[PDB]
Amino acid sequence: LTAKRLQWALVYLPMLVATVYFLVFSADRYVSESVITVRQTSSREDTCYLQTYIHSMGLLQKLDQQLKLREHFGTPLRDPLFRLWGGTSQEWFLEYYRSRVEVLMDDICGLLTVRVQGFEPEFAQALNRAILEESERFVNELSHRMAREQGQLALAAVESARIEATRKLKSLVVVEPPVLPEIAEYPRRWYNLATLLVVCCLIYGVVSLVVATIRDHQD
Amino acid sequence: MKLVSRLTAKRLQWALVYLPMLVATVYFLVFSADRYVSESVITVRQTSSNSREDTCYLQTYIHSMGLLQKLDQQLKLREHFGTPLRDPLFRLWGGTSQEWFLEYYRSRVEVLMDDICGLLTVRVQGFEPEFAQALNRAILEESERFVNELSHRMAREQRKLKSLVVVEPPVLPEIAEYPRRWYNLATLLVVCCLIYGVVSLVVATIRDHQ
Amino acid sequence: TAKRLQWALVYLPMLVATVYFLVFSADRYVSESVITVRQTSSREDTCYLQTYIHSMGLLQKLDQQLKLREHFGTPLRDPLFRLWGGTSQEWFLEYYRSRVEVLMDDICGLLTVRVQGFEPEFAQALNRAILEESERFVNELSHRMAREKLKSLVVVEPPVLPEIAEYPRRWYNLATLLVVCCLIYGVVSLVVATIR
Amino acid sequence: TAKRLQWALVYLPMLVATVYFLVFSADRYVSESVITVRQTSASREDTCYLQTYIHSMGLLQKLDQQLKLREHFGTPLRDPLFRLWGGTSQEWFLEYYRSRVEVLMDDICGLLTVRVQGFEPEFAQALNRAILEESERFVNELSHRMAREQGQFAEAELEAEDAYKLALAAVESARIEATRKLKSLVVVEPPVLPEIAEYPRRWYNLATLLVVCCLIYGVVSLVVATIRDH
């Protein structure tokens, strides 16, 4: 258990693996963020509804039928970690999508920021636009169905029910529309490499100090 | 006290160190039964004005008994849950009591409440995915019927008053979420080790003391 | 000596509990019901129901309706949980309060009532009579207020016929008694050894 | 190893700093304005909408099409670290603009303070006025987007006579809603024209560099002592 073996098996090997991954094997991932809010036309419950519905399963069924997500995410064969392996289960696909699309909530303003990822910037922007339009359609159809079933003299009630069923009661205002990225911000190769270098340097130092400490006993 | 010296290091190991993974491996791999899960997300609204409390009403009503009787008459849960004879732990034995059936149904159907803004999530386990989806849909339809009858009664004593919002409809699973075989094996390894270390220390000090 | 506290402290309660729970105990079925009072047009009415269920007048009306004094005297084999004949009215009140457990869930205003009895149909009938009389009192309060169907009772979970005896848990009671008896033995042995 | 160790993590770092700061650095002028939106005839949510929109990306595209900040921010060649290099990424441009434009909100009153940076005073003032005008137009456009859909719905409904009356009244209400300035932005302090720079604070960063260099020197001396005792 010499120092050469510890340096080779704790510092040089993991840094070598990380270097030959992040430089020649990793696949770039472009993000396309947007900032949205849903308001009543002359609201925390509706933004919770949107936050849940974005990570839902029916939205995935619609989006996979629309923009062909599965065959897009299987394109980069060089990177084996972030690619979507073919023939995988539906639950793995759902978890992969939930990892790719990140939704954050600003509770002070109730603003939903959605950052989607894709291996092509145009695909990421198209996916974000599809998410926005499907979210608006869902938040509209919910109120449409609710008012139509609630409304279902008598003639005035029928007229009120039909005009409520056809009215655009809800609307989604796009504060910051889905942008088209130019370069990929993921993965942060150099930051990850520096963090890993610090971590294995500290780990090697700690284990070397421990080894010297146990070796101190010389009966 | 004479049996304390019998417990050598090799003995206590076969005792709680290896044995447990033997039985865990012969159960979780060749004896357990898959359990597909269907998940739905709902919330009831204030349409009967012309509302978390109604959601807790629904939370108590889902884990009730009359709903279980209705579902047993409708979809025959009792005969379905006895299907896997391979795994008795995850199976409903025939001829059991009604209360044990109620506890089994409460264990299978899991209801959670997102409390920051009140979203009712329901996860239903079944040995076939289509049966889990059907049970979830039946639970939702009886849910809507009860929340409508909840008002229909006082309206009659004094039209769809309330309504059920379906954020996430009952999905049809493809692969089985439970049981987590390798995960349970890993946690079992961790616990069996920890207790072996602790009991080795305590048997060492009780051997030294006497 | 130390054998006196070894035997007479922990063993004799275990033989007593064994000869009670195994043979001398009487099975007690239990029914449950989950309700909420709501106006037909409200926590105050819920608190009114809470203090009215465990009251005196309701006990008199229930004794007239169903004669619980005869029903709680049937099992002669159980000397503790049976209702002794010719007891005081106050002991009857405490017995009724023990046999009918009401729990309040105030995060949404839910009443739950669990009624124990030696017959399952009797337990269901007692639960239904309690629900009916509580509803009658709920509207009678407003009727007497406005005299010089105002309110209704919402039934989340109606009374249920029990099939097996949920109470008492013999093995659970024996185990927790064993644990406490051993603890008591441990503490008294430690102090009686460290006093020396 | 012993004496040359300090001649690297402290003195040399402090040096590569003063010759850059007092010779290589170029001044950066600051233009300050204080704004608050208001409903005509709380209002904090629209102010925080505005806070999001100022640092947003579409506003940067509009400002680049209007005033062409890309070539302006690359004019001073004397600062390799502070200028905007040519051919850099769009995201780096967004980060640079976010760094240059500073937005604060005081919440006990809800006033927005916008402090923009530049290399000329006239350019800084014109940029501040550009964000002011674009924000004032943006709030009105956001409010009118919610009204043009109602106008379209009323036009669809327009396609006994009481139905005609309500269809005309609703479409007239939608028309007068779509053409009215519903959200108006009032300026407490208009953008000002600076005279001297303030944000190239030479003496402030030198103390921080001194502190971090002393900390690095101490920790590196301690680990060197460790490895020497080993």
DSSP annotation string for C87-140: --HHHHHHHHHHHEEEEEETTTTEEEEEEEESSHHHHHHHHHHHHHHHHHHHHH
How far is it, in rounded angstroms, from Cα C97 to Cα C53?
9
Structure's resolution in angstroms: 3.4
How crowded is residue C41: how many other Cβ atoms within 10 Å of its Cβ? 8
Residue C44 structure tokens: 């105050």
Q: How many CB pairs under 8 A join A and B?
A: 45
Hey, which residues 57-86 in chain D have their CB within 8 Å of chain A?
A: 57-58
Burial level of A68, CB count in 10 A (0-12/13-18/19+)? exposed
Experimental method: cryo-EM
Q: Looking at the complex, does the CB of residue A142 fall below 8 Å from at least one CB of chain B?
A: yes
Question: What is the C-alpha to C-alpha distance for residues D64 and D75, in angstroms, rounded to an integer?
Answer: 15
Instruction: Kindly identify which residue of chain B lies nearest to residue C155, measuring between CA atoms.
Output: B150
Q: What is the DSSP letter of C5?
A: H
Query: B126 — phi, psi (to 5°)?
Result: -155, 155
Token digits of residue C97? 């309060």
What's the N-to-C CA distance of chain C in angstroms?
12
Q: Quick one: DSSP state of residue A29?
A: B
Helices (H), B1-113: 9-12, 19-28, 52-62, 66-75, 77-80, 98-108
Could you tell me which residues are beta bridge partners of residue C117? C29
CB C95 within 8 A of CB C80: no
Q: Identify from C157, C161, C169 which residue to disrupt to test chain B contact, counting B C-beta atoms within 10 A and taking the largest count.
A: C157
Token pair for residue C54?
A: 């465990």
Report d(CA A31, CA B182) in Å as an integer.
34
- Report the b/e string of D144-178 with b at 16+ CB within 10 A: bebbebbbebbeebeeeeeeeeebeebbeebeebb
Query: Of A115, A159, A129, nearest to A66 (Cα)?
Result: A129
What residues are paired with D190 via a beta bridge?
A: none
Q: Which of B47, B60, B38, B206 is nearest to B128 (CA)?
A: B38
Q: Where are the beta strands (DSSP E) in chain A?
A: 30-40, 102-106, 111-118, 170-176
Half-sphere exposure of D35 (CA within 13 A, CB side): 26
Q: CA dihedral defined by C10, C12, C13, C15, rounded to 10 degrees?
A: 120
Residue whose C-alpha is closest to residue A104's, from A45, A35, A49, A177: A35
* Facing D146 at nearest CB: one of A41, A183, A212: A41
Partners of A156 in beta bridges:
none
The residue of A44, A48, A169 whose CB has the most chain B CBs within 10 angstroms, and thus the best one to mutate to test that interface, is: A48
Please, are residues A150 and A49 in contact by the beta-carbon 8 Å criterion?
no
Q: Which bin fits A78, alpha (ψ -120 to 50), beta or left (φ > 0)?
A: alpha
Q: How many CA atoms lie within 13 A of B94 on its CB side?
A: 6
* D136-A35-D131 Cα angle (round to 5): 25
The first and second tokens of residue A72, run together, are 């897009």
Radius of gyration of chain B (CA): 24
Set of chain C residues whose Cβ sits within 8 Å of the Cβ of B153: 152, 154
In this complex, is the C-beta atom of B175 within 8 Å of any C-beta atom belonging to chain A? Answer: yes
Q: Which of B44, B52, B65 to mutate to test the interface with C (most CBs of C within 10 A)?
A: B65
CA distance C4 to chain B (A): 21
Contact indicator for B47, A146 with CB cutoff of 8 Å: yes
Q: Six-digit token pair at D58?
A: 């579409």
What are the beta bridge partners of residue D203?
none
**DSSP structural state of residue C9:** T
Cβ atoms of residues C110 and B60 within 8 Å: yes
What are the tokens at C156? 């989340």
Cβ of B167 within 8 Å of Cβ of A49? The answer is yes
Q: B98-120: buried (b, 16+ CB within 10 Å) or exposed (e) per residue? A: bbebbebbeebbebeeeeeebbb
**A90 with B119: Cβ contact below 8 A:** no
Closest by Cα among B138, B140, B68 to B106: B68
Cβ A179–D230 below 8 Å, yes or no? Answer: no
Task: Kindly report the length of chain A.
Answer: 219
Q: Are A181 and D91 in contact (CB under 8 A)?
A: yes
Nearest alpha carbon to residue D213 among D10, D1, D2: D10
